[PDB]
Amino acid sequence: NIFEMLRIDHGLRLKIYKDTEGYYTIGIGHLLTKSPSLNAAKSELDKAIGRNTNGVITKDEAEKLFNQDVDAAVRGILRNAKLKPVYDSLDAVRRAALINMVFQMGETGVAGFTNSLRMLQQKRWDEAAVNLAKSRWYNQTPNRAKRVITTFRTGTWDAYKNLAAAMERVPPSHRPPWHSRVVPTTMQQAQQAMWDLNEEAEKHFSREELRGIWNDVTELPADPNWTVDQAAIACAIDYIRRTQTLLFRHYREGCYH
Amino acid sequence: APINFTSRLNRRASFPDGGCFDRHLIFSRFRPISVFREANEDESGFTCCAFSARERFLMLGTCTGQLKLYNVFSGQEEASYNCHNSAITHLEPSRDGSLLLTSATWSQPLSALWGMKSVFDMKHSFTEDHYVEFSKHSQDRVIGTKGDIAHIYDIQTGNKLLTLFNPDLANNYKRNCATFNPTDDLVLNDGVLWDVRSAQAIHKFDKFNMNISGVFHPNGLEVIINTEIWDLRTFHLLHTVPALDQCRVVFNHTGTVMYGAMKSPFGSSFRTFNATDYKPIATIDVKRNIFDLCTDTKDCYLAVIENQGSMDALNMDTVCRLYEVGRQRLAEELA
Amino acid sequence: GSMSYNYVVTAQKPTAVNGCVTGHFTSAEDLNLLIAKNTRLEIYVVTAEGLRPVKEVGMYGKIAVMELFRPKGESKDLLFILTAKYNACILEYKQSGESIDIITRAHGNVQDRIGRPSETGIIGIIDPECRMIGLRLYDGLFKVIPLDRDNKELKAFNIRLEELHVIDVKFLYGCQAPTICFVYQDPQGRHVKTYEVSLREKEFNKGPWKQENVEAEASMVIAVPEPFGGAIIIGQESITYHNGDKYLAIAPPIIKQSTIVCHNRVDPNGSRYLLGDMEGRLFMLLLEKEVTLKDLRVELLGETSIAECLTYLDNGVVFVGSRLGDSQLVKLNVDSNEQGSYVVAMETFTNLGPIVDMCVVDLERQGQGQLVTCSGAFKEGSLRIIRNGIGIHEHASIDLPGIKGLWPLRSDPNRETDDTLVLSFVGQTRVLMLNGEEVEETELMGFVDDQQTFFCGNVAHQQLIQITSASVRLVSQEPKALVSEWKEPQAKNISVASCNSSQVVVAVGRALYYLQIHPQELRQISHTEMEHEVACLDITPLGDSNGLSPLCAIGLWTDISARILKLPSFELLHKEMLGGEIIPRSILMTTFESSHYLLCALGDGALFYFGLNIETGLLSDRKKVTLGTQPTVLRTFRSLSTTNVFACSDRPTVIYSSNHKLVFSNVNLKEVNYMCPLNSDGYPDSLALANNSTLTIGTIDEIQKLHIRTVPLYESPRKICYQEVSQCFGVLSSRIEVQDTSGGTTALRPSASTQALSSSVSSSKLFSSSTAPHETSFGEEVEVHNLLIIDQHTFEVLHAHQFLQNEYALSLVSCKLGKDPNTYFIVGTAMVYPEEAEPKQGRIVVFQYSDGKLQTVAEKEVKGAVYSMVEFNGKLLASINSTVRLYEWTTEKELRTECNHYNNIMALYLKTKGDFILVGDLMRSVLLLAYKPMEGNFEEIARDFNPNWMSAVEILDDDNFLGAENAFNLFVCQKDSAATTDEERQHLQEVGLFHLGEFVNVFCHGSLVMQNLPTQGSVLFGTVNGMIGLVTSLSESWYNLLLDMQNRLNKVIKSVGKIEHSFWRSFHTERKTEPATGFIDGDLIESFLDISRPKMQEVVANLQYDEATADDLIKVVEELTRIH
Ligand SMILES: [Zn+2]
């Protein structure tokens, strides 16, 4: 039931839609075309599926489309140096879980789990499950991963049976802002943001007041680990937090400027 | 209507107001259960709180324009979004869970509307509307406020459907916020009742206050301006309540309880009131400065955004603290 | 997503009366009484007889308004009903000859999507002109439905009502225009105001008379008819009259004692009114006229049941509609009795509501539970014993001991009725004549008395037989002489006998003789020797109506065989080897609903029954049931054209058929040994039974029903539990007393706790130092709470234990704890002070009732009200205000706490299964705990965070939890132990929703059907209206089948008022409204058996399961009815 597996892991949509890159898609993640023309997409679907559809198909249509994608994906595995060994090593149910992975992170990304796949071949299932959880693949999409991993481990579809309605989900995070505390940034960028914020800040407070915040911020202890650049960028970010906080409280109190 | 709960419970089983007494007991009790701190910050910068549409997540705006969503059950951060270039000052998701309204402090756009299905992106911006809010009955339109002016837009076209302002009747209220009545037929702006279809000003209420614009009671029968409760039909003054002075007033989902939250210029407490007769239920004193609060639709949790430390100190560390409604700590508990 | 599969059916319809109205609804000529019982509407014709039942219908809604009206141009009344869910309809009663149907004349839903429902609830009034219907549904609004005949959808229109808190409202009589008159409340006081209702402008105009300032507690307005007009206004201390500028006030002291709550016009002149108050007193309100109103006068008439509503019918007969007690038909007399009462009860109508608590007990027999309920409210409070079975109407009883046999015998050929009866005693025989009603000894000569009679009766050719231990004796009638006589050749003893009109088969040891009855002759036809000794015989002629049977049923010794032999050859046609090694004692051939069976009861209570083919003798479809221990005697009787088999044993049973499935129904008697039918001139369609001491004669009912025995208490029962080991019940009760000038309290009437055989009062000093609260005042009421010890047989109050002053008894358990072998009554209490918001004090008190005395074993002071207690693995689990606490019973016999749980608003309800604990909350619906025994504390497994105001809870199984809440809905929660995260694992998902329309106070596992040898589990439940329901589980296979059946039934069944069944059963609160899921409406499924077979065919079309015909599903639904 690899179709049903991916109906729950990836989702099924019956009307044409756009994926996260803006490309036109149908069924279970079946890319129709990268063209921006919906009519170019509606004709690729109209040739793929037998009839004229106007961009709407029924589940039986989508599975026919899905199985060819699976057919196309196994041909990619069957022609891979790092994946053909272990694809032949598994029964139907457990290879449908490796097809699940190449659908997610590309067949080249799956090829990364070198020692994870070595254990699978050797049919060492429990040990492969534990090393598979130590990947960002697991830590980013833990729901999907631990249900595919239970398929690798036991050769059943049990992680897919009688499930409950999915808990409320929320869109993926944006790319972190420049002042994110683990993604690095530059000093001009930090310096410009202070300059920008100060346009607004100087309308409400004196420069002596704003210097007091700069002083207050730079007189706190820093990482003995930090470079002088990293320490200065840290002072700018704290300054911006403090000042934006003071602006927020000022407007709440009432700004007559 | 026996005063003692145990007498009311017995009478219910055999001889069925008592709901008012039940609310006085329930909505006088708040025990804190969780604190949410901004990840990777020694001093949290939360400014705004609201619950997810299915309230699985607590939505927390930050002083730098970010919107950070936390799993309520686990406290772990689930997602972060970049919304504005200044502190988030207001949040309002749609009931269906598809859209979200935000409001900033000084950056432009002040307010915006965001999608929440698969990609968190801007749908439309309301460049100079400092406050923004959905229509009540059908969440099809957006009402924003620019000073004394009210703007109404459509949540799909984005275009300004109409503009409500009358310089002759206006009160120039400090904290003016335009809003719909529960039927979307009326709009109150700056203390002036408007008829939406005719775009005509129905009535101007008298100004006994400088800041507060006013809200519609969810019962469709009253209009609450600061400390003054006006009959929506006759325009007569029904009650005067000094406790509501200058308080942001929220209603619970069923509209039977009214929250209100306020040297240092901010407040340390929030009050609850029986929504049906405005008698005060309790005054819950947090020891900290408060900047926002919100309830869920289940009357289970109350999220309050509290400044850590001394009140007059005004430290930067501002967290969000969850309370469980109707729940208290006993002496035997604290061991 | 997940889903549950539950099914819920009504065991007892609601019995409380929510409203009653009078008028001319079935025809213009006769007088109807209409009763509303929450969901059912009962129509009666008023007679000198009492009430003639005419038609009972049900609705997909709770009847909130019910008022008759006559539009001009209509020949008889129409009925307006408004549903609690705001379904509105107008109804007409049409009798198409033999068939009766209530047709929906107009219908619609009048709901404002923004509305604050009023304090005093829905009010519905109709003006004297029948020109409008007025609804007060919400505050500040007055809905109006114009009544001109175009308005087939009940299109309404609201009028903005300035006054926002209206107490009561009525349309006035004798007004220029339609005018409402209402009491309303504002900060100045409460007042009476009038408005005119402009129907053509759709607004209010200034009313006829000004407003006045009425009593603080004025609560009902009465519209006085012409010529007087105006309004009477009832309060707690005054009754006032108001008109143009006329006004009068009386304040009789008599009415201050209790609040008047309902009223009724006696005469159309409006000169007299009935008033009922909350302690049951019935008053006459008389308006004195001169002509104009001179004065008002109240006169006490007597006492009725606490009346929810009153209606004077005719000739001084008053219907008292009660919901706290039994409804009544009552007569007002011109003359008072000894006591000075004019009120004499004529007829009592059973009301089980409110069911405050209940329990199931196997008192009399084993395997068939009875319900024992705490019912009624104050002076109406009672225990109700609910038993399933068939009841006999005793009409005679003679103490003639030691009967071995009994037969109805006709004496005179010229008459058609049994007017003699013969009895067998060990060794000899007597005959009695049955003239009139009372019997006296005779003997018809030709009958012996020195030997034991084995049979006698009417045989062919106008003559009578009697078979004894040593003779078959045949006796002609008109001369009445011994006319023929048979005897075994060597004169041995006749062991077994059997006979019918034309045939005799008798056994002597292993021999059988077949003899025919011809004029003046016993012709021996054939003889045989059976393999083994003969135990029992039957030659009942079945089927193709001959009177002469080709078959002989026989049961034998030493091989437990039932054999069907062919007469006269005695050919073996069938040999069924039965189980065991005890003899068959009674074998019988009968026909149930045109289908032949062979019945054969063995000694050890067991009874097989086969399908018998009366042409080939085949025995098929062997089935076995057990009917006691004393060996069973089978004996046949017919009712109208049906036939039944009465099975005499230590547990008497009646066997009949219902849709071709046999019923085995308990008989409400002690132990019947021998039985016969008897249609005498003085006992038509009756029976005759012999209980080993007495011989009783009476009438039996057709089908089995629920039978209710009432134990009055004259107090409020609150909780009940059963102690098997001391063969008594524990019952918590309270009575109301009033403070007097002595400083103490006085009861209003004797009652269970004041008239116990023995009694005690609490010695506890446990709340001495604690604060002295607000003192009580003279004339004010207080509650005195009592533990009652009630004997399981006599239901006498053996002992009454009075609790402390101001102490409420809240919860009760009977159990043993720890290593202690004693069984205790454990009581949870609260110190309830009326000014205090919540009890902060309480007790858990361990009693034991041993050797007729109650002792206090132990005591524990707690810090709040003990709402619930459960025996939990030899430990005491209790809820004290918001904490759940587990107690251990030490070897010193004191309670010592093991662990606490604190995540509650108010922990009201507790149930347990294994180590799991279900907690029900005031507002935050339900919560699952587990006792972790290797840590000795609680683990919180999962919660439901939705705001369901719980009223009762129940564990259906380890994963499924049943809830009832204050909006009359049911729901089911599931845990998912097999969930991949702790967030999932710790959330109970609501997977079942259903609007019951009742308010549930108690669940408990049990069944009122005997169960020996389609449906899993049995949870009974009791409601405020006295309705008793049943919840059970289904497989997904069955749920899908019956869910399909339901939607098909809904297209075919017409609903009164045209209410959609899915709208009625939709889960509905002021927070959300959702369609039902996971619940089969068993009442809808069962109504399948009542539709016409055309309708039945239309439902079954296009349907398959393990096609599907109409007959397949009659077998399904009939099987379903047997769970209750
Ligand atoms: Zn400023």
Numbering used by the authors:
A (entry chain C): -165 to 91
B (entry chain B): 1046 to 1061, 1067 to 1312, 1327 to 1399
C (entry chain A): -1 to 288, 295 to 1017, 1023 to 1115, 1123 to 1140
Publication text:
The Vpx/Vpr family of lentiviral accessory proteins usurp the substrate receptor DCAF1 of host Cullin4-RING ligases (CRL4), a family of modular ubiquitin ligases involved in DNA replication, DNA repair and cell cycle regulation. CRL4 consists of a Cullin4 (CUL4) scaffold that bridges the catalytic RING-domain subunit ROC1 to the adaptor protein DDB1, which in turn binds to exchangeable substrate receptors (DCAFs, DDB1- and CUL4-associated factors). CRL4DCAF1 specificity modulation by Vpx and Vpr from certain simian immunodeficiency viruses (SIV) leads to recruitment, poly-ubiquitylation and subsequent proteasomal degradation of the host restriction factor SAMHD1, resulting in enhanced virus replication in differentiated cells. To obtain structural information regarding Vprmus and its mode of binding to the CRL4 substrate receptor DCAF1, the X-ray crystal structures of a DDB1/DCAF1-CtD complex, and DDB1/DCAF1-CtD/T4L-Vprmus (residues 1–92) fusion protein ternary complex were determined.
Our X-ray crystallographic studies of the DDB1/DCAF1-CtD/Vprmus assembly provide the first structural insight into a class of “hybrid” SIV Vpr proteins. Vprmus adopts a three-helix bundle fold, stabilised by coordination of a zinc ion by His and Cys residues on Helix-1 and at the C-terminus. Superposition of Vprmus with previously determined Vpxsm, Vpxmnd2, and VprHIV-1 structures reveals a conserved three-helix bundle fold, and similar position of the helix bundles on DCAF1-CtD. Vprmus binds to the side and on top of the disk-shaped 7-bladed β-propeller (BP) DCAF1-CtD domain with a total contact surface area of ~1600 Å2 comprising three major regions of interaction. The extended Vprmus N-terminus attaches to the cleft between DCAF1 BP blades 1 and 2 through several hydrogen bonds, electrostatic and hydrophobic interactions. A second, smaller contact area is formed by hydrophobic interaction between Vprmus residues L31 and E34 from Helix-1, and DCAF1 W1156, located in a loop on top of BP blade 2. The third interaction surface comprises the C-terminal half of Vprmus Helix-3, which inserts into a ridge on top of DCAF1. Moreover, side chain electrostatic interactions of Vprmus residues R15, R75 and R76 with DCAF1 E1088, E1091 and E1093 lock the conformation of an “acidic loop” upstream of BP blade 1, which is also unstructured and flexible in the absence of Vprmus. However, in the Vprmus crystal structure the bound Vprmus now blocks access to the corresponding SAMHD1-CtD binding pocket, in particular by the positioning of an extended N-terminal loop that precedes Helix-1. Additionally, Vprmus side chains R15, R75 and R76 neutralise the DCAF1 “acidic loop”, precluding the formation of further salt bridges to basic residues in SAMHD1-CtD.
